[PDB]
Write a protein that binds this ligand. Structure first.
Ligand SMILES: O=C(CO)N[C@H]1[C@H]([C@H](O)[C@H](O)CO)O[C@@](O)(C(=O)O)C[C@@H]1O
Ligand SMILES: [Ca+2]
Ligand SMILES: [Ca+2]
Length: 449
């Protein structure tokens, strides 16, 4: 290493036995406005396997000294009996100081492959209510935590936000378990929690599926890592959270959900697959997509100097795919770019804006496995250059991957970056499949060397 270069020796920020979890996957890492680092992760309690073959809880650690020391952690979401929360994402509303963590939630027995269609909510007279089902398949609704039957008679059952099921006020089970007399629909749900004390305490989960999941979506999940809050332009203040979904045919398409009211209400935008123009001119849609090749899956979003959004997406082309939005994530330009300078082995990636210019250019930082497998973990600095304009007159931005640094030889899978208070880069990465999750700090002198 050159003199002054910083690449800290890896710290196992999560590992077998921490919080009595045997396994860990899916890192998220975020520096709050106050300067605290929040790291979130799936505590996979029965091996590394994805839902439904596990019981997965959400864990958090905090650092108040720039990542040099970390607290003893806490579990912030835990559903019973193999109902899992998987794939976390972190963002903050800088106006209110509220930190958000969102995650995908499945009842017991459900996961990506067998999620049922739709939101799991039903409209009764203008409001969406979570449905519950008994053993005969009869449908009930939960209205302000009171269970009503199909004839709108109040039953003896109530619920709470965690899904506990109470009979005349006594807990008997939980609507997410394999044994409850009333169960939620077996599908994915987006859950949201928040902290107003810099990550020390967290709310109980809000189920926002009724706002963001459409009737024709089977799986709808958080794309893990981080979100953004838009800094420039007409959508300044919008909180943007990457997601992805499958249609009835099981084919995956990326999107973002977003909030213009500090996280109170959410909307899902279109996918880049909606009215996408494929390489030779075929027009597709995420609702009708029937082929594997154009799928767009996990993704992360960054903001260009004028506010334009770029969605970096896991896909099946072997290379990075990038979509562009002129309207704050509501829709995407018809052309998804393939960047053959950036291998993408079908794995989650991390990309963040960087606050200072590099070589006279606005820059982003990027992390993924630079290979055709989950290996050769590489952190890149991409310099933003405008190369002309679209037909609508908007600027066209391209990335120059000028610096590309191998940080993890051997296994490298999911990862998440953050800029640190000192201008350096923190990185939490899967350097093992599902055991030790490693944290390092790197400076730009190292990354450019
Ligand atoms: O299964 C889900 C969503 O419910 N998420 C997993 C996700 C999905 O299974 C995958 O993105 C679906 O194509 O991928 C991982 O299996 C992986 O590729 O390593 C890990 C991630 O937690
Ligand atoms: Ca649990
Ligand atoms: Ca489009």
């Amino acid at each position: 290493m050159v003199e002054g270069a910083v690449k800290t020796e890896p710290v196992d920020l999560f590992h077998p036995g921490f919080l009595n979890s045997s396994n860990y996957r899916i890192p998220a890492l975020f520096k709050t406005k106050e300067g605290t680092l929040i790291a979130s992760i799936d505590a996979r309690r029965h091996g590394g396997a994805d839902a439904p073959n596990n019981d997965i809880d959400t864990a958090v650690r905090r650092s108040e000294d720039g990542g040099k020391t970390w607290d003893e952690g806490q579990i912030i979401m835990d559903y019973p009996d193999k109902s899992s929360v998987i794939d976390t994402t972190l963002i903050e509303d800088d106006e209110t100081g509220r930190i958000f963590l969102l995650v995908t939630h499945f009842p017991s027995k459900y996961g990506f492959w067998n999620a049922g269609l739709g939101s799991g909510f039903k409209n009764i007279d203008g409001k969406e209510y979570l449905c519950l089902y008994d053993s005969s398949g009869k449908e009930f609704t939960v209205r302000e935590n009171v269970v009503y039957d199909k004839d709108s008679n109040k039953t003896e059952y109530t619920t709470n936000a965690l899904g506990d099921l109470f009979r005349n006020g006594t807990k008997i089970d939980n609507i997410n378990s394999s044994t409850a007399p009333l169960k939620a629909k077996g599908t994915s749900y987006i859950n949201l929690v928040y902290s107003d004390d810099d990550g020390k305490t967290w709310s109980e989960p809000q189920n926002i599926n009724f706002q963001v999941k459409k009737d024709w979506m089977k799986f709808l999940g958080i794309a893990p890592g981080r979100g953004i809050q838009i800094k420039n332009g007409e959508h300044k203040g919008r909180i943007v959270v990457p997601v992805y979904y499958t249609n009835e045919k099981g084919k995956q398409s990326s999107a973002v959900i977003y909030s213009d009211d500090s996280g109170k209400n959410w909307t899902i935008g279109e996918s880049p697959n909606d009215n996408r123009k494929l390489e030779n001119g075929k027009i597709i849609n995420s609702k009708t997509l029937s082929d594997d090749a154009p799928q767009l899956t996990e993704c992360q979003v960054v903001e260009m100097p004028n506010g334009q959004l770029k969605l970096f997406m896991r896909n099946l082309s072997g290379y990075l795919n990038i979509a562009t939005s002129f309207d704050g994530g509501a829709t995407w330009d018809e052309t998804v770019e393939k960047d053959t300078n950036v291998l993408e082995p079908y794995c989650q990636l991390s990309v963040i804006n960087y606050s200072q210019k590099v070589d006279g250019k606005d820059a982003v930082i990027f992390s993924n496995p630079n290979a055709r497998s989950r290996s050769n973990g590489t952190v890149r600095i991409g310099l933003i250059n405008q190369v002309g304009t679209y037909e609508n007159g908007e600027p066209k931005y391209e990335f120059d991957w000028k610096y590309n640094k191998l940080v993890k030889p051997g296994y490298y899978a999911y990862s998440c970056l953050t800029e640190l208070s000192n201008g350096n880069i923190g990185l939490l990465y899967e350097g093992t499949p599902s055991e030790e999750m490693s944290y390092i700090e790197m400076n730009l002198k190292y990354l450019e060397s």
